[PDB]
Amino acid sequence: LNMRADLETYVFQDNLATAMRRDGEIYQSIVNDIYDVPRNVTITLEDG
């Protein structure tokens, strides 16, 4: 139970101190296509 407790603050610590580590479902590459009109809750396309 205390393992899970220390694991909760592990997330909130590591994402600040070590930093970075932003989360979301997206596509990394610089230079994109267009629009976001359907988008949400998909895996694979919508567009590039």
Next chain:
Amino acid sequence: LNMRADLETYVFQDNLATAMRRDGEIYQSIVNDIYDVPRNVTITLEDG
């Protein structure tokens, strides 16, 4: 656990003295010098 620690101070020791044996998989083949192109995020022959 201390045997695993011996393996940590093995890699850190042996690679400096004995050295060599650097491969990308089981071959070190192709890419020459440097490459700076990448594509999307996927790495083909490229920087492979």
